[PDB]
Design an enzyme around this catalytic site. Structure first.
Site, PDB file in Angstrom:
ATOM      1  N   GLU A 206      35.690  92.448  32.138  1.00  0.00           N
ATOM      2  CA  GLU A 206      35.724  93.890  32.263  1.00  0.00           C
ATOM      3  C   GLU A 206      35.808  94.783  31.105  1.00  0.00           C
ATOM      4  O   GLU A 206      36.729  95.612  30.914  1.00  0.00           O
ATOM      5  CB  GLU A 206      36.868  94.257  33.289  1.00  0.00           C
ATOM      6  CG  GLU A 206      36.721  93.577  34.714  1.00  0.00           C
ATOM      7  CD  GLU A 206      37.915  94.005  35.571  1.00  0.00           C
ATOM      8  OE1 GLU A 206      38.379  94.871  35.473  1.00  0.00           O
ATOM      9  OE2 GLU A 206      38.105  92.859  36.533  1.00  0.00           O
ATOM     10  N   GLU A 387      36.623  87.604  40.549  1.00  0.00           N
ATOM     11  CA  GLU A 387      38.141  88.237  40.732  1.00  0.00           C
ATOM     12  C   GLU A 387      37.717  89.116  42.350  1.00  0.00           C
ATOM     13  O   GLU A 387      36.627  90.054  42.480  1.00  0.00           O
ATOM     14  CB  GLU A 387      38.162  89.513  39.666  1.00  0.00           C
ATOM     15  CG  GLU A 387      39.483  90.063  39.964  1.00  0.00           C
ATOM     16  CD  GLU A 387      39.777  91.342  39.223  1.00  0.00           C
ATOM     17  OE1 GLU A 387      38.876  92.446  39.460  1.00  0.00           O
ATOM     18  OE2 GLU A 387      40.834  91.710  38.281  1.00  0.00           O
TER      19      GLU A 387
HETATM   20  C1  LIG Z   1      40.960  93.047  37.989  1.00  0.00           C
HETATM   21  C2  LIG Z   1      42.066  93.676  38.741  1.00  0.00           C
HETATM   22  F1  LIG Z   1      41.414  94.261  39.989  1.00  0.00           F
HETATM   23  C3  LIG Z   1      43.154  93.909  38.643  1.00  0.00           C
HETATM   24  C4  LIG Z   1      44.109  94.662  39.652  1.00  0.00           C
HETATM   25  O1  LIG Z   1      44.060  96.160  39.050  1.00  0.00           O
HETATM   26  C5  LIG Z   1      43.704  93.327  37.346  1.00  0.00           C
HETATM   27  O2  LIG Z   1      45.098  92.739  37.268  1.00  0.00           O
HETATM   28  C6  LIG Z   1      42.786  92.291  36.468  1.00  0.00           C
HETATM   29  O3  LIG Z   1      43.438  92.304  35.258  1.00  0.00           O
HETATM   30  C7  LIG Z   1      41.432  92.816  36.478  1.00  0.00           C
HETATM   31  O4  LIG Z   1      40.700  91.678  35.739  1.00  0.00           O
END
Ligand SMILES: *[C@H]1C(F)=C(CO)[C@@H](O)[C@H](O)[C@H]1O
Length: 489
Positions: A206, A387
């Site tokens: 991300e 994820e």
């Molecule tokens: C993906 C995710 F949705 C969350 C929640 O806010 C984070 O904890 C992760 O690091 C992110 O990669």
């Protein structure tokens, strides 16, 4: 029953900064994020929660327990990152004959000797500890996706407080080609040390959220919290190049698949008049990036060109998904609407009557089918769901969330899309960045006083899914929306 291919794997994703610290001996104070969440002024402003990551779930010490639970749960795939900071906590000498003012980074020369020179700087205790973690992981029959980067940078590459204050004389993170150059070399080095254990690679997690919340969404309390459209663009340009150069780096030392993990929303139209707004949102938040690192297509200046050093730098796409974004057409372009997707009240209902999480995110599993099928039809590269999860300490919504999202992956595969696994965010509760520990994403609840893990009922449901390779007849009713009548409005 909803049966997945015999080769498809169920597992989990986890970040170093979020899960490692909490056991004495694990502390890593050498990142922008560490400094950022300890900053006195950030704490007074409320940009960060005041919770500290060294009070975390202690994966660094307790990884044997995490892996015991994953194996009992029938999980067969794991995705984790090494923390750069852990491996190279101290400044590297600036390179000779590399022009720090050139916009483009088309090559980073890496060989046996540049790698052996790095060895001299590498923290050997960190490398050996990670090797111990990864071996224990593999000993449970867990397929291993290694990610190089999940947001924190070495302090020697980014001092986020200096940048927040408007000082660009210091280490400036992704705003500097130096960070790009060193990222390619780090990635090469890690593959060179770990490729015997690793099954597939990701460069980054991300990188769009790092630049988006760091330089525009500054209320998020993401480092360096310097509000600038211009610097947001420079960040994203440097991350595209860092990705390509890291790919080449890894491919110089491994024949194994190299991908990237990216944050996706399902863009949805407010009315039937807003379909063009959906396409414009998809171009701006998704295609522009993937067309760069797949097709080498990019805009530098006000001109559309093809960079041959960017083309073909991707073997697979990691799809990160939690909710939709509702958009409408404007005169000037399009806007996102509050009251839907990520912009809702916490523990409530969206404007469409759908339940929201502990974080204010709307329940919208069909978005995951939208994103997987749109990636497939554009690029025909294979995908992992790297994820998917929900903030839900009580576990009220998670069983519905888990089964509904897994059904949508089954729907994508059935449509023809090549999706090879589903990795839940996350196995256990962890440090939710600027929000701290209150946002609990785990299948397993963490008591932070003791580091003990507990099985939320949704963990028992996931074990049914993973050990059967299917949504079983007995849990198929959870493919539905959590009933809102008993929940808060
Ligand atoms: C993906 C995710 F949705 C969350 C929640 O806010 C984070 O904890 C992760 O690091 C992110 O990669």
């Amino acid at each position: 029953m909803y049966s997945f291919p015999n080769s498809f794997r169920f597992g989990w994703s986890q970040a170093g900064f979020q899960s490692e610290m909490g056991t004495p001996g694990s502390e890593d104070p050498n990142t922008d994020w560490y400094k950022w969440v300890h900053d006195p002024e950030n704490m007074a402003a409320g940009l960060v929660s005041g919770d500290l990551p060294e009070n975390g779930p202690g994966y660094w010490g307790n990884y044997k327990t995490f892996h015991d639970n994953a194996q009992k749960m029938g999980l067969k795939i794991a995705r984790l990152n090494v923390e750069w900071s852990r491996i190279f906590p101290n400044p590297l000498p600036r390179p000779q004959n590399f022009d720090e003012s050139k916009q483009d980074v088309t090559e980073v020369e890496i060989n046996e000797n540049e790698l052996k020179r790095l060895d001299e700087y590498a923290n050997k205790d960190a490398l050996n500890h990670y090797r111990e973690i990864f071996k224990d992981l593999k000993s449970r029959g867990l397929y291993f996706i290694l990610n190089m980067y999940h947001w924190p940078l070495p302090l020697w590459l980014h001092d986020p407080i200096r940048v927040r204050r408007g000082d660009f004389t210091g280490p400036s993170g992704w705003l500097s080609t130096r960070t790009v150059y060193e990222f390619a070399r780090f990635s090469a080095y890690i593959a060179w040390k770990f490729d015997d254990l690793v099954d597939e690679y990701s460069t980054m997690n991300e990188p769009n959220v790092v630049g988006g919340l760091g330089y525009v969404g500054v209320k998020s309390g993401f480092p360096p919290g310097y509000l600038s459209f211009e610097l947001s663009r420079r960040h994203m340009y440097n991350i595209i190049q860092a990705h390509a150069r890291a790919y080449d780096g890894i491919k110089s030392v491994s024949k194994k698949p190299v991908g990237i993990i990216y944050a996706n929303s399902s863009f949805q139209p407010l009315t039937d008049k807003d379909m063009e707004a959906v396409e414009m949102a998809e171009n701006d938040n998704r295609w522009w990036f993937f067309d760069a690192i797949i097709r080498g297509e990019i805009t530098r200046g006000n001109e559309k060109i093809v960079r041959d050093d960017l083309k073909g730098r991707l073997d697979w796409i990691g799809v990160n998904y939690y909710t939709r974004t509702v958009v409408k057409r404007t005169e000037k372009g399009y806007v996102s609407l509050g009251g839907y997707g990520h912009g809702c009240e916490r523990n409530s209902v969206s404007l469409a009557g759908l339940p929201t999480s502990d974080f204010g995110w709307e329940f919208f599993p069909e978005g995951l089918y939208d994103v997987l099928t749109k990636y497939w039809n554009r690029y025909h590269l294979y995908m992992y769901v790297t994820e998917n999860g929900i903030a839900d300490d009580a576990d009220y919504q998670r069983p519905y969330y888990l089964v509904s999202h897994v059904y949508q992956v089954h729907r994508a595969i059935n449509s023809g899309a090549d999706v090879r696994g589903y990795l839940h965010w996350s196995l256990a509760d962890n440090y939710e960045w600027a929000s701290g520990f209150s946002m609990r994403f785990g299948l397993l609840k963490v008591d932070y006083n003791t580091k003990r893990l507990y099985w939320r009922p949704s963990a028992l449901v996931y074990r049914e899914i993973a050990t059967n390779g299917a949504i079983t007849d007995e849990i198929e009713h959870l493919n539905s929306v959590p009933p809102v009548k008993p929940l808060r409005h």
